[PDB]
């Protein structure tokens, strides 16, 4: 996207599984400031819960 | 002397056409999946047989024939009914 | 509490004074309604701490924080902020707090020959808000800071204004003369 934009930074969601997987979305960073905990699917099994990876 | 102007313009803008209007009219057939109407809002209300995508598009849930009704001016639906 | 049976001293006080068809057809009093509307200017956490303690000790009931009706006039206004506080009192606690008034609020009033007897709710109801806070059985200067004031509105199922007039008055109310 538009590089020097500090709010709504695009970061991915890596599974707690270790399947080898990742989603990709955008938090406002005027919000979370720590990380993100979401509950998405995972082809390499069924239902993981993801940590907002660096 | 002659002319130097110098004025410009600040408009001259528009957007490429959005092909709206009712696509499938009233009394013609249909197939399932077939879109019957495109619209901005609820210009045409989902009737019995028809579904409404995000656009408020009207699509057909199963085949048959197309039935229009306006409810005495301002409220209006299209439905489907088979060939029997 | 007893003001219940007092209402019932009124029931045929006017069913025998007037000429009504029935006993439910004579003006009851749904809710007393209190508005602690600081607002416009006063935007301190402390004055709503205070309005809260105050309201919740005088009427023994939690206060609802009424906000800015998105009205943002030329002065100091905006959208989501406390510009009025509210506590609706009805039935039981209504009769209790109203008795707290006629008993320990109305005489306590510094300078008081009764209150405004001009036609209120033209539909035949009432309001009456009143300034002063230093005329109370609960509001103490020894338990507050500076001086505030209340704004009250009582609802009466009267048909016209003379009938509310009569109602409120025979119930224990001074109309200044």
């Amino acid at each position: 996207a538009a590089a020097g934009a500090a709010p709504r930074i695009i970061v991915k969601m890596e599974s707690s599984a270790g399947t080898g997987f990742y989603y990709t979305t955008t938090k406002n960073r005027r919000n979370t400031q720590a990380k993100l905990e979401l509950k998405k699917y995972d082809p390499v099994a069924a239902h993981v819960v993801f940590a907002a990876a660096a | 002397a002659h002319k130097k102007g110098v004025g410009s313009s600040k408009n001259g803008r528009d957007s490429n056409p959005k092909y709206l209007g009712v696509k499938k009219f009233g009394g013609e057939v249909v197939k399932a999946g077939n879109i019957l109407v495109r619209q901005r809002g609820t210009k045409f209300k989902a009737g019995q047989g028809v579904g409404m995508g995000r656009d408020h598009t009207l699509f057909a849930l199963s085949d048959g024939k197309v039935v229009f009704i306006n409810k005495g001016k301002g409220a209006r639906f299209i439905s489907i009914e088979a060939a029997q | 509490q007893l003001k219940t049976k007092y209402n019932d001293q009124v029931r045929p006080a006017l069913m025998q004074q007037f000429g009504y068809s029935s006993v439910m057809a004579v003006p009851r009093i749904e809710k007393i309604v209190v508005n602690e509307g600081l607002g416009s200017s006063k935007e301190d956490s402390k004055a709503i701490d205070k309005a809260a303690k105050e309201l919740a000790l005088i009427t023994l009931q939690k206060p609802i924080i009424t906000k800015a009706k998105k009205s943002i006039s030329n002065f100091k206004l905006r959208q989501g902020m406390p510009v009025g506080i509210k506590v609706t009192l009805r039935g039981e606690r209504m009769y209790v707090f109203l008795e707290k008034l006629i008993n320990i609020g109305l005489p306590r009033i510094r300078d008081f020959r009764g209150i405004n007897p001009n036609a209120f709710d033209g539909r035949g109801n009432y309001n009456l808000g009143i300034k002063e806070q230093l005329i109370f059985p609960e509001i103490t200067y020894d338990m507050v800071d500076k001086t505030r004031g209340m704004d009250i509105t009582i609802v009466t199922t009267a048909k016209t204004d003379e009938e509310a007039r009569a109602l409120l008055q025979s119930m224990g109310l001074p109309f200044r003369k």
Partner: protein, 136 residues
């Protein structure tokens, strides 16, 4: 004369005059015959004309009103770069439509004050008297 605030700009078209072809407000009334345009000054003209004639002062009803922005490009440019700034204002008077109603004067004053009025305009004209009675 001019108006207060608006849209800004325009266009043009014709075909006969809607309303109101009837003699309200006055006893005597002057009526257009041609699908003209009419300007702020073109009417302020007749204002000051008839208002000369009637003295102190009559009762004068300007049934028309300029609302149309007409433009002219800056003189001497080749077209393009814009539409013309707003030159002047126009009342789009169509025929049968009645422009002036007066009373509070007599028949002679109507004839003459209307004569002098109509000698200031792009139109042949007919003056008359009431009877148009669909609604007073």
């Amino acid at each position: 004369k001019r108006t207060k605030f608006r849209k800004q700009f325009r266009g043009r078209m014709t075909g006969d005059a809607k309303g109101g072809d009837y003699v309200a407000f006055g006893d005597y009334g002057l009526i257009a015959m041609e699908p003209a345009w009419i300007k702020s000054n073109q009417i302020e003209a007749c204002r000051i004309v008839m208002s000369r004639h009637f003295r102190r002062g009559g009762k004068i009803y300007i049934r028309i009103f300029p609302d149309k922005p007409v433009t002219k490009k800056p003189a001497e440019t080749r077209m393009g770069k814009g539409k013309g700034a707003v030159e002047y204002w126009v009342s789009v008077v169509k025929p049968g439509r009645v422009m002036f109603e007066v009373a509070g004067v007599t028949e002679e004053q109507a004839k003459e004050a209307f004569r002098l009025a109509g000698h200031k305009l792009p139109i042949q004209t007919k003056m008359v008297k009431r009877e148009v009675y669909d609604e007073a």
